[PDB]
Amino acid sequence: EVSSILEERIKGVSDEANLNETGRVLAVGDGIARVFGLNNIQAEELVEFSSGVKGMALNLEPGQVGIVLFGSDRLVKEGELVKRTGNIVDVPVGPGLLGRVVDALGNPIDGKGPIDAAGRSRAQVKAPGILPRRSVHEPVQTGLKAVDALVPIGRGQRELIIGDRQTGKTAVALDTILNQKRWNNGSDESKKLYCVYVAVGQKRSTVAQLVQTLEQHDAMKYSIIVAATASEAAPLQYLAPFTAASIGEWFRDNGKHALIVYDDLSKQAVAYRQLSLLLRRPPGREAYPGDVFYLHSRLLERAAKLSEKEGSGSLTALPVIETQGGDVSAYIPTNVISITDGQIFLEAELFYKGIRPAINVGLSVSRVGSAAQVKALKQVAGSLKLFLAQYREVAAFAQSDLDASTKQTLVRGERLTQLLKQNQYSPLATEEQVPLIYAGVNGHLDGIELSRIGEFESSFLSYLKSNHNELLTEIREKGELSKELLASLKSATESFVAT
Amino acid sequence: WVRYEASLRQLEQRQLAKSVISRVQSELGNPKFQEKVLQQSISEIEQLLSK
Amino acid sequence: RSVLKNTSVIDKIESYVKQYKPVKIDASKQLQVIESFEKHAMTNAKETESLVSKELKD
């Protein structure tokens, strides 16, 4: 058993071959080593040192090569023999990475042994051209109202999630993965996202809580977790998003829909800053190097909704930006904003002030998000953003006397805001979001006293199912609210209002 | 039950891991340490001639 | 029971589930006492109905 597996492994050690290897380390420390020899070396190779650690050749210079140690300096030392892997940095990619935690070297840190992987693919790969790119049509549903309504999110898009640290930052994304459990545990592969959670710079303990939550919601089987914790070395952290995206691209290049959440790219910036400084390349604004724009932009544009030629694959990016104080003019945030489609700025003040989840509607945009929305969620949600940007206006100037028109808006607005809120780590179904939005929009929640809003939601949904889940089944399949359905729903909702 | 079963396999593997270390220390004592250099030598002779 | 090595519990719970696969009996049994409430109700129903019909025409 354990003996047989070990014996198979021992048998799999068999002879070393001659070939161009061996450089000798000289000046080493500061996480770069200067190696003598390595005369013919492909650029950006992976070299494995006989210190049992690997590095990526960065600077190919006349007479010397400067490896960058992808791993601890502790074991590397002067006059060590550096052996050429001979290959550019590639990472295993395939189908069997699904439901396996791995670290950045692809080592199974789920420890479920060797990963099944179809291929390996180069860490840096250019983004697909204009011609392979079809405009978005399929939505991504997060199961959180307003995060689908007010913020419309669709496949392929680089839809930014920006906000402040540890405001349960992770939770917004986790909820997305969870809602799409329903569809991803579906049988339609057009309705299967394969979602990748990139955990960079987070405590290994915290990641272990995340892993445990994901396995509690039995969500592990449709998702991969790549991990590059805070302790884990900065060059590994630098290569961590890029590697994850390669894995994502294999799904995308199976034409299959996928999504990747990059938590947190701001920590990649600090890592790249560290790396750059240790390469003593000049620092940029806020001490973040000048190629920081290039770093983020090359990463981000690999996420796309490809055309029919490429099998209409998606790789929806959700990159998670950690703003220092809500510094929305800060160099790293602004640089990311410019690359990304939309923003999903999360209002920290409101978060603290009991709006969970808190979405700063003003600072949330989605560049091409709204044509991903299904017609039901366009019709029902029609103008609710405007209405709540009338609530935004109304409460702006509310701070004396209120005209009845203003008061009506305020009463609706305050109550509508209550409706938006969701219980953290428990997202609602897509089907369910349609009536709730219907209620408020069609003014059924206008009268409902503020205290009972929570009751209204649960009771309304229970009512709808018990009275006629037929309506919901229809809206589930049709995905368009017919005039008959609209009237029937008006009638039904009014019926619930009465009770 | 399945979980602890996997745990026992891991525990067995780390037990056999420290036994591998014990076997390594034994190997490096032997003048097999000397005699196997001859084996490597002839193997390299065969190998490098096969290059 | 194609991954467990700490066996002889899969057959146990297989037999425990398939044993109590007959779960305790159906709870249809109130239809004599439930019918009685309906009788009392009916008495009252007819009283209201006949009274108001009479009164309407009156």
Domain-terminating residue out of A54, A71, A87: A87
Cis peptide leading into residue A73 (ω within 30°): no
Residue A165 to residues A175, A322, A346, Cα–Cα distance (Å): 17, 5, 11
Q: Give the orientation angle of helix A404-420 with respect to helix A384-398, to 10 degrees.
A: 120
Residue A407 to residues A361, A396, A403, Cα–Cα distance (Å): 21, 13, 6
Token code pair at residue A304: 């796309």
Give the CA count within 13 Å in the CB-facing half-sphere of A230. Answer: 7
* A322: enclosing H helix or E strand: strand A316-323
Compute CA C19 distance to the chain's CA centroid, rounded to the nearest angstrom: 24
Bridge partners for A162 per DSSP = A321, A345
Is A378 in the same domain as A365? no
Is A14's Cβ below 8 Å from some Cβ in B? no
Is residue A230 classed exposed, middle or buried when 0-12, 13-18 and 19+ CB atoms within 10 A define those classes? middle
Any residues with CB less than 8 A from the CB of A430 and at least 6 apart, and which? A141, A143, A148, A179, A182
Give the CA count within 13 Å in the CB-facing half-sphere of A48. Answer: 6
- At A264 the three-state DSSP class reads coil
Quote the CA–CA distance of A33 and A171 in Å, as a whole number.
40
Domain-terminating residue out of A87, A119, A137: A87
**Residue appearing with tokens 């700025």:** A345
Is A309 in the same domain as A430? no
Quote the CA–CA distance of C38 and C45 in Å, as a whole number.
10
Looking at the domain assignment, is residue A30 inside a domain?
yes
Number of H helices and E strands in chain C, helices first, is 2, 0
Is residue C27 classed exposed, middle or buried when 0-12, 13-18 and 19+ CB atoms within 10 A define those classes? exposed
Quote the CA–CA distance of B40 and A389 in Å, as a whole number.
79
- At A227 the three-state DSSP class reads strand
Residues in chain C: 58
Is A144 in the same domain as A181? yes
Bridge partners for A93 per DSSP = A119
The two beta strands, A23-28 and A32-37, are antiparallel
Looking at the domain assignment, is residue A82 inside a domain?
yes
The total of structural domains in chain A comes to: 3
Is A408 in the same domain as A435? yes
* A122: enclosing H helix or E strand: strand A119-122
Using a CB-CB cut-off of 8 Å, the residues of chain B touching A3 are: 16
B29: closest CA of chain C, how far (Å):
39
Cis peptide leading into residue A357 (ω within 30°): yes
**Residue appearing with tokens 């050429």:** A84
Is A165 in the same domain as A109? yes
Rounded to the nearest 5 percent, the helix, strand and coil shares of chain C are 60, 0, 40
b/e map of A9-20 (b: 16 or more CB within 10 Å)?
eeeeeeeeeeee
Residue A440 to residues A377, A412, A437, Cα–Cα distance (Å): 13, 8, 6
Token code pair at residue A111: 């420890």
Using a CB-CB cut-off of 8 Å, the residues of chain C touching B10 are: none
Quote the CA–CA distance of A86 and A107 in Å, as a whole number.
20
What is residue A281's DSSP assignment? P
What is residue A158's DSSP assignment? B
What are φ and ψ of residue C9, in 5° steps?
Answer: -135, -20
Any residues with CB less than 8 A from the CB of A182 and at least 6 apart, and which? A429, A430
Compute CA C34 distance to the chain's CA centroid, rounded to the nearest angstrom: 11
- At A108 the three-state DSSP class reads strand
Quote the CA–CA distance of A373 and A137 in Å, as a whole number.
8
Looking at the domain assignment, is residue A2 inside a domain?
no
Is A368 in the same domain as A431? no
Residues of A labelled as active-site residues: 367
Looking at the domain assignment, is residue A52 inside a domain?
yes
* A404: enclosing H helix or E strand: helix A404-420
Token code pair at residue B29: 């004592």
SS (H, E, C) chain B: CHHHHHHHHHHHHHHHHHHHHHHHHHHCCCCHHHHHHHHHHHHHHHHHHCC
CB A70 within 8 Å of CB A56: yes
Token code pair at residue A33: 């080593």
Nearest to A224 by CA among A355, A78, A110: A110
Is A314 in the same domain as A350? yes
Interchain CB distance below 8 Å, B1 and C3: no
Q: What angle do CA A102, A6, A111 make, to 5 degrees?
A: 15
What is residue A26's DSSP assignment? E
Q: Give the orientation angle of helix A234-252 with respect to helix A292-300, to 10 degrees.
A: 30
Interchain CB distance below 8 Å, C3 and B4: no
Any residues with CB less than 8 A from the CB of C50 and at least 6 apart, and which? none
Q: Which of C6, C8, C11 would you mutate first to test chain B, the one with the most B CBs within 10 A?
A: C6
Quote the CA–CA distance of A199 and A238 in Å, as a whole number.
12
Is A54 in the same domain as A145? no
Quote the CA–CA distance of A395 and A348 in Å, as a whole number.
18
Token code pair at residue A393: 């206006």
Domain that holds residue A334: 88-373
Q: Which strands sit side by side in the sheet containing A316-323, from one edge to the other?
A: A101-103, A223-228, A195-200, A259-263, A316-323, A161-164
Quote the CA–CA distance of A56 and C2 in Å, as a whole number.
43
CB A382 within 8 Å of CB A441: yes
Is B4's Cβ below 8 Å from some Cβ in C? yes
Looking at the domain assignment, is residue A452 inside a domain?
yes
Any residues with CB less than 8 A from the CB of A82 and at least 6 apart, and which? A21, A22, A23, A24, A25, A33, A35, A38, A47, A48, A49, A50, A55, A67
Cα torsion A116, A233, A27, A24 to 10°: value is -10
Is A148 in the same domain as A265? yes
CB A314 within 8 Å of CB A259: yes
Quote the CA–CA distance of A375 and A454 in Å, as a whole number.
27
Any residues with CB less than 8 A from the CB of A315 and at least 6 apart, and which? A156, A245, A248, A249, A251, A252, A258, A259, A260, A302, A303, A304
Looking at the domain assignment, is residue A475 inside a domain?
yes
Q: What angle do CA A296, A301, A305 make, to 5 degrees?
A: 150
What are φ and ψ of residue A88, in 5° steps?
Answer: -75, 160
Query: Which amino acid is it at A166?
Result: Q
Is A302 in the same domain as A394? no
What are φ and ψ of residue B2, in 5° steps?
Answer: -65, -40
Question: For position A57, which CATH number holds?
Answer: 2.40.30.20
Domain-terminating residue out of A347, A373, A399: A373
Using only the alpha carbons of chain B, give its radius of gyration.
Answer: 19
Alpha helices in A180-319 (DSSP H): 181-184, 204-216, 234-252, 265-278, 292-300
Closest residue in A to B51 (Cα–Cα): A18
Q: Is A170 annotated as a binding residue?
A: yes
Using a CB-CB cut-off of 8 Å, the residues of chain A touching B10 are: 111
Q: Which of C4, C5, C7, C12 would you mutate first to test chain B, the one with the most B CBs within 10 A?
A: C5
Using a CB-CB cut-off of 8 Å, the residues of chain A touching B13 are: 2, 6
Cα torsion A34, A40, A42, A46 to 10°: value is -50
Looking at the domain assignment, is residue A474 inside a domain?
yes
Quote the CA–CA distance of A119 and A7 in Å, as a whole number.
26
Count of B-C CB contacts under 8 Å: 11
Using only the alpha carbons of chain C, give its radius of gyration.
Answer: 28
Is A81 in the same domain as A96? no
Residue A102 to residues A93, A201, A228, A273, Cα–Cα distance (Å): 12, 15, 9, 25
Chain C neighbors (3+ CB pairs < 8 Å): B
Interchain CB distance below 8 Å, A6 and B16: yes
Query: What Å resolution does this PDB entry report?
Result: 4.8
* A119: enclosing H helix or E strand: strand A119-122
Bridge partners for A195 per DSSP = A223, A259
Is A184 in the same domain as A56? no
Looking at the domain assignment, is residue A3 inside a domain?
no
Nearest to A298 by CA among A126, A61, A435: A126
What is residue A167's DSSP assignment? S
Residues in chain A: 499
CB A162 within 8 Å of CB A446: no
> CB pairs under 8 A, 24+ apart, for A213-217?
A213/A174, A213/A425, A214/A174, A214/A177, A217/A178, A217/A181
Compute CA C52 distance to the chain's CA centroid, rounded to the nearest angstrom: 36
Interchain CB distance below 8 Å, A18 and B47: yes
Is B13's Cβ below 8 Å from some Cβ in A? yes
Quote the CA–CA distance of A152 and A141 in Å, as a whole number.
9
